[PDB]
Design a protein around this ligand. Structure first.
Ligand SMILES: Cc1cc2nc3c(=O)[nH]c(=O)nc-3n(C[C@H](O)[C@H](O)[C@H](O)COP(=O)(O)OP(=O)(O)OC[C@H]3O[C@@H](n4cnc5c(N)ncnc54)[C@H](O)[C@@H]3O)c2cc1C
Ligand SMILES: Cc1cc2nc3c(=O)[nH]c(=O)nc-3n(C[C@H](O)[C@H](O)[C@H](O)COP(=O)(O)OP(=O)(O)OC[C@H]3O[C@@H](n4cnc5c(N)ncnc54)[C@H](O)[C@@H]3O)c2cc1C
Ligand SMILES: CC(C)(COP(=O)(O)OP(=O)(O)OC[C@H]1O[C@@H](n2cnc3c(N)ncnc32)[C@H](O)[C@@H]1OP(=O)(O)O)[C@@H](O)C(=O)NCCC(=O)NCCS
Ligand SMILES: CC(C)(COP(=O)(O)OP(=O)(O)OC[C@H]1O[C@@H](n2cnc3c(N)ncnc32)[C@H](O)[C@@H]1OP(=O)(O)O)[C@@H](O)C(=O)NCCC(=O)NCCS
Lengths: 545, 545
């Protein structure tokens, strides 16, 4: 098998990459001719040709996925760590992803990105054609066997992360195994918030200030460190991972956009978990087109008064501060008129969730288990102190929010990887333990192949995510890469949960089996931090640059 | 001349079909050489090569899908009824399904049936190559525009069914609109069984005896008639459709396997709805491998006494009879030792669901809304009258059950079509009503394309289903075709619900929005009447014959 000679496999992958880059360039030029025939992209043409544009985004995502998978394996080889399971992941992943470039990439279950969507043709060269045959029955069977015999390891295949990061992984995996995994079914059954004891435990471990500078009471750790924490917490339960994301994003928003006084006032309390935050952006009629939002903030002396409706707000009851985006210029309808507020409020109780004056709200009944809950909120004369307009100058809120998009995308990808990993582990356990026709289910290729493809796609998404974090940790622009990781990761997690449920048969629908909950968790990933359609749009516009 | 007029499309489809049949033959021969190298299929080789075997099943499903889509349009044209929406469904369907034959058919989100899985290659002929380019952006956009102007019609495109069948459609569509759609959210919120008043109304409508002969109090209508009823009831709510399916299958079981006295005693009460039935087959440890089940039945005088555990049993509380499969020969381990019983019991109450002696049970807590509920059942010396052994002779139960498989598969496909249609209609409503970026969502191709592809795949699945019913109604063997309809239809419904949820954004997860429930309903379709993996296995074995 090709995996028997990993050095030859890496060499072929390097030989094949140039034609994939050329393909992406032809695709980009083709899109430009459709949507920007005179130079400037025309909105009506971008809209008409949206399928082709998003096909460019997904094609590019697959080229970068191939680049990062090959790079991962190359760095393992340099370290002497390109072992059999990893070589099979490389073989199968190159085979499958090249094959989908040639035959169709699923943007959604029924929308495929095909080369014909941009009138492109690709005749694979010798190396690419050979690699394209790598996703074989024997390779998948062997991969599934090694997954079964992976006892003791936290991932299917070495990740290539350095030792300090894998020790962080092991710390937060032990936490999830002790305090999250044994308890999530009870939380679901009781329809209850993640217990405050979990928040307090994570706060003492430094989760809420992991990446906040030490000057403000944080740990000053890398974004890669936060990815690993988030992946492991989310493997336990996505909402536990999102507790850490919310603090990390609010803190970046303030670090990048706040006055020095705001940094000193807010960051220590976020870092200790004494101040819990959530984002208050979405409105009943405005979600994807956030620049057009309608909640208004009106001056009253040196302070502000807010009126409007917000919805889909996570963790709205227990938080002390809302990063609240409102329109401060009534003569505007676009992003320029927006300001961001650190809207302090009093945490509520189950029977009195919104005691602060001028604020009302109610829980939204949501599919699955939502451990921070989501809420509709009404603001009617809600007061915000002048000193809590972030940065002090009105009309900068949307640019301040955009400064958080790299991290938000990275953290959504990290959550997706953790959810996907949970689905694969749950599926594997059932496939080994469940007997049918006189043997474990994993002996049947339709079961084992599902698990093999999970391990491959999880590693592809993981390496895209880790590359994005690497770039961010070096201070380089990484919005494209982080967006690709978010786009691919959400799909990978959804497919992994869907196919893990299949392995369970009828038991996959029983609430007693965790996969029923994991399915619902995975489904939110391509919506809750922005729809995949919009993420593909933003990537395509950047690629035309 | 233009190559995309209806005349040209039908001519090209006829020109392309022979090479598709040759591809299917080549694939069958290839599979045979892999799994039956000496003549007899070898179980170990069928297992090793299960992906290639199931790829043959899905390839064949797509060739038959293309054949029936082309046939449908040709019959419309003979009647002057191949209008624009139908011609676009033909165009886009042929383009997409030919493209997937060439590039990969999704068996699941990550498992693709590719020609390379059987070491085949295909160089499309002139006609097939032209047709493969027909799923274009302008075509999808025009289809989505026509779907918005559909005149309150019950389908997107004419079905080709006769006027009597379409009058049945209108009646049951009106019932679902008036009595099911306005009430299903309340049923879910109360976690309650479909009300008995709904059952009484369906019984008055003749649903429970629609296909039972008139000499037994039924209406004596065709299987296609029952498909239409089931589709429209399921569009309302899958469980309402399944009430009808359960009677239709129990009646067929008795009509084909019962003594004359059993027919006379049981059929009139099934037909009137005075006797409600469910199937009692699955056990905690035995589902797909039903021939190995362990529940036992032992003679006691002229009667039988049953001991064992059953699970995943739908509607177990309120039924009067269970079609119960048990092992009557303790020296056996396979299907030969099984007998089918018409196991009469007393319907229960919420408080006391299982008042009959020797039977206990409890509801399984299940994802989504299960309006007949599913139960775990225990039998300990449960009595069955000797006259209730179906057919009077032990050891014929599995063969009697197999007599119902054609109908069961057809009715599963019909439920799937109805669920898929619901998702498409719910998605369309939201896509038109929801504004974002200053226009309705349906103006964006990522939204409109999802809906267009639903209409296409729904019609493809509908025509496969209707072909299977046509064959059954002429008394011809149709197990392959019915299985194909079930295989494709479940996937189409799942994809339709997934993409319709996407169109809703965050609101797709709110229980207030019906799509959250429909997602869960669609997911069961490829498990609840048998796993898709097993359906593909059965098809492949038959194709090898
Ligand atoms: C569990 C959950 C938690 C959330 N947490 C928060 C939170 O804490 N704070 C907060 O503010 N918000 C939160 N959100 C809101 C989330 O950000 C929005 O749901 C998301 O931005 C999508 O917006 P929308 O729901 O209004 O969908 P819409 O904008 O109405 O779009 C609906 C669908 O239409 C498609 N679409 C829209 N526009 C286009 C276009 N131009 N081109 C092509 N397709 C398009 C997309 O498929 C999209 O999903 C949460 C949502 C969920 C589900
Ligand atoms: C909502 C619901 C309603 C139901 N209603 C009824 C009812 O009323 N009466 C009744 O008797 N039963 C009912 N069932 C049970 C249903 O028939 C079984 O769930 C189904 O047959 C699958 O069996 P299982 O769950 O034991 O899965 P298993 O047989 O344990 O299989 C688990 C998974 O393994 C895979 N698999 C298994 N075998 C193979 C193989 N040889 N090759 C490849 N892959 C394989 C499949 O993906 C399968 O889904 C219902 C189930 C559900 C979910
Ligand atoms: O991208 P480049 O090809 O310029 O890589 C430059 C360096 O970043 C490293 N790098 C690139 N992508 C990386 C990733 N996803 N993760 C970790 N390191 C990475 C390269 O290994 C190389 O390291 P080196 O100088 O020690 O040899
Ligand atoms: O040989 P075929 O199966 O293709 O056709 C035999 C008949 O069955 C019909 N038929 C074939 N498939 C059908 C279907 N899916 N639905 C309805 N009729 C069908 C044909 O139109 C033909 O009818 P005709 O005598 O009026 O011409």
């Amino acid at each position: 098998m090709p995996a028997d000679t990993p050095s030859a496999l890496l060499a072929l992958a390097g030989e094949a990459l140039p034609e994939l880059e050329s393909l992406q360039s032809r695709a980009t030029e083709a899109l430009r001719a459709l949507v920007a025939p005179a130079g400037k992209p025309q909105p009506a043409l971008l809209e008409q040709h949206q399928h082709a544009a998003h096909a460019l985004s997904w094609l590019t995502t697959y080229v970068e996925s191939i680049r990062q998978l090959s790079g991962w394996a190359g760095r393992l080889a340099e370290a002497g760590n390109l072992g059999r399971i990893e070589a099979l992941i490389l073989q199968i992943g190159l085979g499958e992803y090249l094959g989908q470039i040639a035959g169709g990439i699923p943007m959604s279950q029924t929308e495929f990105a095909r080369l014909s969507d941009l009138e492109l043709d690709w005749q694979p060269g010798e190396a690419a054609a050979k690699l394209m045959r790598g996703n074989t029955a024997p390779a998948r069977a062997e991969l599934a066997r090694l997954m079964q015999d992976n006892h003791g390891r936290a991932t299917f295949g070495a990740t290539g992360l350095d030792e300090d990061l894998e020790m962080i992984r092991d710390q937060f995996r032990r936490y999830a195994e002790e305090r999250v995994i044994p308890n999530a079914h009870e939380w679901h059954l009781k329809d209850q918030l993640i217990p405050m004891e979990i928040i307090e435990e994570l706060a003492e471990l430094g989760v809420f200030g992991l990446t906040i500078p030490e000057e403000f009471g944080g740990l000053g750790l890398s974004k890669a460190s936060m990815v690993v924490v988030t992946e492991e917490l989310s493997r336990g339960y996505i909402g536990v991972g999102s507790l850490g994301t919310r603090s990390e994003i609010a803190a970046e928003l303030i670090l990048c956009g706040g006055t020095e006084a705001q940094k000193a006032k807010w960051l220590p309390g976020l870092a200790s978990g004494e101040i819990l935050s959530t984002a208050v952006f979405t409105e009943p009629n405005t979600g994807s087109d956030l620049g057009s939002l309608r909640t208004r903030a009106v001056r009253d002396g040196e302070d502000w008064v807010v009126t409007g409706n917000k919805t889909w707000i996570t963790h709205a009851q227990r938080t002390h501060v809302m990063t609240l985006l409102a329109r401060t210029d009534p003569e505007t309808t676009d992003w320029r008129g927006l300001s961001m507020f650190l809207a302090e409020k009093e945490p509520g109780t189950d029977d009195d969730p919104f005691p602060t004056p001028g604020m009302t709200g109610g829980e939204i009944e949501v599919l699955g288990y939502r451990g921070m809950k989501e809420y509709e909120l009404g603001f009617d004369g809600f007061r915000i102190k002048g000193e809590n307009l972030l940065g002090g100058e009105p009309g900068r809120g949307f640019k301040q929010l955009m400064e958080t998009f790299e991290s938000a995308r990275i953290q959504t990808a990290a959550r997706a990887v953790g959810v996907a990993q949970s689905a694969a582990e749950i599926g594997m356990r059932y496939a080994v333990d469940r007997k049918q026709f006189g043997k474990s289910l994993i002996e049947f290729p339709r079961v084992a192949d599902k698990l093999a493809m999970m391990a491959v796609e999880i590693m592809i998404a993981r390496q895209l995510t880790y590359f994005s974090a690497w770039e961010k940790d070096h201070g380089r622009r990484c919005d494209l890469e982080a967006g690709m990781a978010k786009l691919l990761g959400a799909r990978v997690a959804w497919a992994a949960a869907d196919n893990a449920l299949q392995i369970h048969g009828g038991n996959g629908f029983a609430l007693e089996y965790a996969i029923s909950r994991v399915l619902c968790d995975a489904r939110i990933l391509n919506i809750f931090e922005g729809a995949a359609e919009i993420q593909a749009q933003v990537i395509a516009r950047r690629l035309l640059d």
